[PDB]
Amino acid sequence: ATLFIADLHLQTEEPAITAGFLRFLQGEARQADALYILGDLFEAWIGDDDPNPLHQQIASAIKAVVDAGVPCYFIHGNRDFLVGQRFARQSGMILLAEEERLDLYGREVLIMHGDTLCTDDQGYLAFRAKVHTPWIQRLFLALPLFIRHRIAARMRADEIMDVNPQAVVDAMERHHVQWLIHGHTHRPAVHELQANGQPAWRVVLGAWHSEGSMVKVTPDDVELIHFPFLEENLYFQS
């Protein structure tokens, strides 16, 4: 099986999510053929030189999955688009492009974070175009870490728009797939549509708000799975 997760929004103020992700990496992920993280792994990212201990904790945990023989891949989200090759090396993850076509047991599947499908949010797409401009990222990353932290804290102090159905069809026809997996919108669901003259499906990951969410693709099926962060020990009441 191949696993997909997204929209964890890890942060030191939410240790329950971190614990849930560490439990996921120690258990389920170790049995996978591959793990794809489709963006928004972190609530924020201001560059790989950030000494935030959570980053090293997460990198070590992911690296243990990689060393266990499970390749891990990352597509950037709207929150963590500055994740770079230094973190990729620390974590053992492979950085992928904003759209990737996968062969999953003979099924061609398009994966992406999903924010680029939300083409009705014209203001966001303009912001996205700016912060994905390479010379702008290079200038921001050049600023001192304490400045970047102040910029980020100020900006974060300032409802997620859903996908545009025509953008979905465009993407699945550009890639000639019948299957699309994405996150970003926080509306876990399976949508049927038509692409390339045939039925097509759009599978949406959940955010890790109160429980975890993953998509698990097998040779036989596609599974959207919700599970508790921590081991829920049963006990009995007379």
- The binding site for Mn(2+) consists of 7, 9, 40, 78, 113, 184, 186
Q: CA–CA separation, 108 vs 104, rounded Å?
A: 6
Which of 103, 104, 121, 207 has the alpha carbon at shortest distance from 164?
121
CB atoms within 10 A of CB 113: 26
Residue 50 makes contact with ligand U2V by CB under 6 A = no
Tell me which of 184, 195, 200, 215 binds Mn ion, using CB under 5 A.
Answer: 184
Residue 78 makes contact with Mn ion by CB under 5 A = yes
Residue 137 makes contact with ligand U2V by CB under 6 A = yes
| Interactions with ligand U2V, residue window 82-101 (CB under 6 A) | 82
Name the binder of 7 from ligand U2V, Mn ion, none, CB < 5-8 A by kind.
Mn ion
User: After which residues do gaps appear in the chain, with C to N over 2.5 Å?
Assistant: 158
Name the binder of 2 from Mn ion, ligand U2V, none, CB < 5-8 A by kind.
none
In the complex with Mn ion, the residue whose CB is nearer, 7 or 28, is 7
Q: What is the 3-state secondary structure (H, E, C) of 130-192?
A: HHCCHHHHHHHHHCCHHHHHHHHHHHHHCCCCCCCHHHHHHHHHHCCCCEEEECCCCCCEEEE
Residue 76 makes contact with Mn ion by CB under 5 A = no
| SS3 category, 26 | helix
Least distance in angstroms from the C-beta of 238 to ligand U2V: 49
Residue 77 makes contact with Mn ion by CB under 5 A = yes
Which of 7, 224, 225, 194 has the alpha carbon at shortest distance from 114?
7
Strand partners, 50: none
Listed ranges 14-22, 61-69, 131-139, 189-197: which one lies at the site for ligand U2V (CB under 6 A): 131-139
What are the residues binding ligand U2V (CB under 6 A)? 44-46, 78-79, 82, 115, 118, 121, 124, 131, 136-137, 140, 151-152, 155-156, 160-161
